[PDB]
A = this chain, B = another copy of it.
Amino acid sequence: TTHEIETVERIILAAGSSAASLADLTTELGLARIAPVLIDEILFRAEPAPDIERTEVAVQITHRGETVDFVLTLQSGELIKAEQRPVGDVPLRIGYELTDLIAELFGPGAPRAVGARSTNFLRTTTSGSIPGPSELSDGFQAISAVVAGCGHRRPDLNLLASHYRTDKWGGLHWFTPLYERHLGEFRDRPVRILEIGVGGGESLKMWKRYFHRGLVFGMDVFDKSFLDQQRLCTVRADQSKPEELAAVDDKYGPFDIIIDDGSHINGHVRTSLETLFPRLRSGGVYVIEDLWTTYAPGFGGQAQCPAAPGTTVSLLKNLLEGVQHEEQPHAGSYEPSYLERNLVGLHTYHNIAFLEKGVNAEGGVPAWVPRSLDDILHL
């Protein structure tokens, strides 16, 4: 279904393009093809359903004469369902123009405060007039949850990590705020993200939610195809085999972001960086979680300090010195390595490192700048 992941990509790109480009896409695919992709997105982002009794909420999408109706069913502790049925008597209604809802789910930039949709709230009550205290309270909560799933309002990544139950926040690690600092500027971008290391898929769900325009790719040596869903593809590949990493990029890249949360075997960490850093988009970010295995013999680490050559912390110390390559003394001719030339910033926190890729060539300090505090006070 690599024709089905290209259709979502096309809807996502048109959502941040010209009116003409969005008009040409909605013409070609039609309402009947696009609507179910939008309904899938609403179910995924409106979860979890509030603590309420089975309540129906209607969603209608219109585009150039055509209109399609869906009814969503919300109930405490249950998966939100949708069926293509008439709105009929359902007293909780949301209406969208197709172009508005595509921009509301997949558009970049500030969410719209007002005028993106129509709404009908209990204009008729099963009560007859003033609704039951239950019907009214459950009604507010139901239609609010669906509207929340219809947009791209900024989510709190700390809560998403607790909600999807990933170890990225709340005990073993405190990463998600640093992910907001370094990946936040890409939330609006149509990104392709690769997480090495997927039982599992929690963190993949979190990235699908955070990057509302993203395609999420989960790489593991074991099959995880049962996690596959819209904008979330799992791939089988070994991070210790350069040819399998290349095949992953050849098929699903290039990636704006690559996160190594895999085996944490020092060798694997080093191979994934050497192979994938060159394939990462310039201006993109490479992340390595779980630095601690640097010191664990069972992960190809050494239990010494300073960290032993060929361990993740030793690597981070060499990358750090690599950023200053232009200022280093070089006997005769020298060309900078790929990592010296393309790593413009290294962010080191407890148990995690962020590698900014970019052109690292500002030129070293000119020869005409004094190389002693002598010649300064002598001028």
A50 to B351, CA, bound (A): 27
A65 an interface residue at 8 Å Cβ cutoff? no
A17 CA to B190 CA in the complex, in Å?
7
B366 to A108, Cβ gap below 8 A? no
Cβ of A134 within 8 Å of any chain B Cβ, yes or no, is no
Among A35-43, A269-277, A316-324, the stretch that binds chain B is A316-324
Across the interface, which residues of B come within 8 angstroms of A127, CB to CB?
368
Q: How far is the CB of A374 from chain B (nearest CB, A)?
A: 6
A residues 297-356 touching B (CB-CB < 8 Å):
297-299, 303-307, 313, 316-318, 320-321, 323-324, 326-330, 344-351, 356
User: Do B360 and A350 touch across chains, with their CB atoms under 8 A apart?
Assistant: yes
A207: Cβ under 8 A from any B Cβ: no
Contact B350 A326 (CB under 8 A): yes
- Chain A residues 194 to 236 lying within 8 A of chain B, measured CB to CB, are none
A329 and B305 contact, Cβ closer than 8 Å, known pairs A18-B13, A313-B320, A324-B313: yes
Nearest-neighbor residue (CB-CB) of A300 within chain B: B373
| Chain A residues at the B interface, C-beta cutoff of 8 Å | 9, 13, 16-19, 21, 50, 95, 97, 99-100, 103, 108-123, 125, 127, 129-131, 136-137, 139-141, 143-145, 147-148, 153-154, 156, 158-159, 161-162, 165, 167, 169-172, 174, 177-178, 180-181, 185-186, 188-190, 192, 254, 263, 265, 281-283, 291-292, 294-299, 303-307, 313, 316-318, 320-321, 323-324, 326-330, 344-351, 356-375, 379
Given A119-B362, A313-B320, A329-B305 in contact, is the A108-B111 Cβ separation under 8 Å? Answer: no
When the two chains form the complex, which single residue of B137, B154, B373 contacts A265, counting CB atoms closer than 8 Å?
B373
Asked, given contacts A122-B171, A294-B327, A356-B114, whether A17 binds B19 with beta carbons under 8 Å apart, the answer is no
**Bound-state Cα–Cα, A16 to B186, Å:** 11
Q: Is the CB of A115 within 8 A of B359?
A: yes
The reply to whether B114 and A177 form a contact with Cβ atoms under 8 Å apart is: yes
A373 CA / B239 CA spacing, docked (Å) = 15
Residue pair B324, A373 in contact (C-beta under 8 Å): no
Q: Contact between B99 and A282 (Cβ–Cβ < 8 Å)?
A: yes
Q: How close is A317's CB to chain B, nearest CB, in angstroms?
A: 4
- CB-CB under 8 A from A186, the residues of chain B are 109
Enumerate chain B residues within 8 angstroms of A348, measured Cβ to Cβ. 320, 323, 345-346, 348
